[PDB]
C-alpha cells in the first residue's frame, strides 16, 4: 500500500470514532464481552498513538515499513466496511441473527485479531516484526528458510511456499486454508498469523492433515465465532449433555476454546493446556464431555 503519513492516521482515527458512535446505539444491545468493539477501537487508537509517539522525527522510517502500510490500509478498509454495513443494513442491524448483525460480530473479531497482531509486531510501540518469535521450532524454520526475516507476505506468495512442503490438495482447500489463517482478512499472511495457525494446528509434521481433521471435516469447528456465539449456539442442545463445539480463543490467541453442555445443565467453555486439540478432544470424548459435535450423534474419530 501507499506510504503512511500523519494525515492518513488522522483519517483512520476519525473513521474509528464514527464506528464507535454507531456501536453505542442502545438498539444494538452490544454485550461488554471480548471481542468488544467499544474497547478495541479506542485501544487500537491508543497503541497507534504509542507507535507514532516512539517514532517522533523518524516518521519517514515508520511510513515506509511494509507491515505498517498493509496494516493501516486494512484498518481504514475495515472501518469503512463497518460504516457501510450500518447504513446498508439499516434497521436490520438490531434484529439479532440477521446477516448484517452477524457481519458486525465477525468484524469485531477481526478488529480483535488486528489489535493483537499490531501489539505483537509493535510491542512497546517499536517495530520488531523482523525479530518476532515463531512458537513452534519447525514452523520457525519454514518461515525463515522461505521468507527470512520478513514480517508479512502476500497470500499467493505464502500459499506457494507452503505448497512445496505441505502439498495443498485443491483450489477449494486452498481457499478454506486462507480463510482459516487470514485472521485479519487482508489477503496477506503476517508472521504473527502464521504463528497462531501453526500453534493451533501443530504438529508441523502433519500440519495440513491436522487442520483437515480438526476444521475442514470436523462439524464441531466454528470459524470466526465468539464466546457469546458459542454459548448461544449450544442453547438448543441444553438438554443434550455432551454436545460440544470449539473455536479460536479470542483473548488467548493461539489457543483453543471448547464449549460444551454438561450433565447438570451448564454450558461451559474451557481452554485446553499442555495438550494439542487432538488429545483434548479424544480425552473429552472418553470422559463423556465431548460426545456430539455441534449436537450431531456421530463424533469424528481422530484416534488415527
Amino acid at each position: 500500500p501507499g506510504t503512511v503519513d500523519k494525515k492518513m492516521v488522522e483519517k483512520c482515527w476519525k473513521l474509528m470514532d464514527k464506528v464507535v458512535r454507531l456501536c453505542q446505539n442502545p438498539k444494538l444491545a452490544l454485550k461488554n464481552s471480548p471481542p468488544y468493539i467499544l474497547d478495541l477501537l479506542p485501544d487500537t487508537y491508543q497503541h497507534l498513538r504509542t507507535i507514532l509517539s516512539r517514532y517522533e522525527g523518524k516518521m519517514e522510517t515508520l511510513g515506509e515499513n511494509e507491515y505498517f502500510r498493509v496494516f493501516m490500509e486494512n484498518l481504514m478498509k475495515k472501518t469503512k466496511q463497518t460504516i457501510s454495513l450500518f447504513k446498508e443494513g439499516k434497521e436490520r442491524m438490531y434484529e439479532e441473527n440477521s446477516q448484517p448483525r452477524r457481519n458486525l460480530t465477525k468484524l469485531s473479531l477481526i478488529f480483535s485479531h488486528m489489535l493483537a497482531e499490531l501489539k505483537g509486531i509493535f510491542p512497546s510501540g517499536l517495530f520488531q516484526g523482523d525479530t518476532f518469535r515463531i512458537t513452534k521450532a519447525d514452523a520457525a524454520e519454514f518461515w525463515r528458510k522461505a521468507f527470512g526475516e520478513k514480517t508479512i507476505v502476500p497470500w499467493k506468495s505464502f500459499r506457494q511456499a507452503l505448497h512445496e512442503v505441505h502439498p495443498i490438495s485443491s483450489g477449494l482447500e486452498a481457499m478454506a486454508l486462507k480463510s482459516t489463517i487470514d485472521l485479519t482478512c487482508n489477503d496477506y499472511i503476517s508472521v504473527f498469523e502464521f504463528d497462531i495457525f501453526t500453534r493451533l494446528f501443530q504438529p508441523w509434521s502433519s500440519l495440513l492433515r491436522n487442520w483437515n481433521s480438526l476444521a475442514v471435516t470436523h462439524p464441531g469447528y466454528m470459524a470466526f465465532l465468539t464466546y457469546d456465539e458459542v454459548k448461544a449456539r449450544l442453547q438448543k442442545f441444553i438438554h443434550k449433555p455432551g454436545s460440544y463445539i470449539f473455536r479460536l480463543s479470542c483473548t488467548r490467541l493461539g489457543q483453543w476454546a471448547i464449549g460444551y453442555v454438561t450433565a447438570d445443565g451448564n454450558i461451559l467453555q474451557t481452554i485446553p493446556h499442555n495438550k494439542p486439540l487432538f488429545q483434548a478432544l479424544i480425552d473429552g470424548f472418553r470422559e463423556g464431555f465431548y460426545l456430539f459435535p455441534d449436537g450431531r450423534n456421530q463424533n469424528p474419530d481422530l484416534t488415527g
Binding site: 461488554n32 471480548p34 483473548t251 467453555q269 474451557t270 481452554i271
Partner: peptide, 9 residues
C-alpha cells in the same frame, strides 16, 4: 469496559 468471558477448568 469489557468484562472477561467466563472460562472454566
Amino acid at each position: 469496559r469489557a468484562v472477561e468471558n467466563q472460562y472454566s477448568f
